[PDB]
Amino acid sequence: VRMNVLADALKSINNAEKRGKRQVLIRPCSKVIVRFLTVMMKHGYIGEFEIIDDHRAGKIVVNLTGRLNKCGVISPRFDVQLKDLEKWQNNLLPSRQFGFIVLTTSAGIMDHEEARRKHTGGKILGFFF
Template identity: 80%
Template sequence: MVHMNVLADALKILIRPCSKVIIRFLTVMMKHGYIGEFEIIDDHRAGKIVMNLTGRLNKCGVISPRFDVPLKDLEKWQNNLLPSHQFGFTILTTSAGIMDHKQAR
């Protein structure tokens, strides 16, 4: 008998706590089609987000702590982080907002 994870096929998830950075990150992910719509629930505490998944997201990671990367070193970071030149996105936090690596150029 094979035991499978029940959450592996989940199409809705709950994210808490909610912050402006998370909302802007999810907006960029939705723009690229990795996730579906999301709804912000205000519970007068930290807030919650209910997000619909599309099944396109394989892996999502974070680099902690946040590093200061100049524009000339951006290509080097992409080569180290992304599996292929045409596959995946690096999402950056800049003074102009949160954007992907193609938009930051």
């Protein structure tokens, strides 16, 4: 079935970090997975990643640093509107000095710190810290 593709991509990344692996393969690939990985890599929680291209949905190989502590998904994509955001990042995040919430806004997939910097709400996807 695989209702949600991002959920199992993130759970398979997170099951390997607990194990000390240097790399993972995750499949199928998707547009939202690549954007979420780019957001997670711009900050420095993962290394580079490579996309393997079959003529189907494809597969990704990720180089894992040892910096990632936990990444995860919020199961229904709730609407979040720049006033709920503080009450959201007081449940999901472990502190006020690190850890990011990832949300899709009409200006792309980004983090909360940029969402407030651009005055935009959207839908929550997940978090990593």
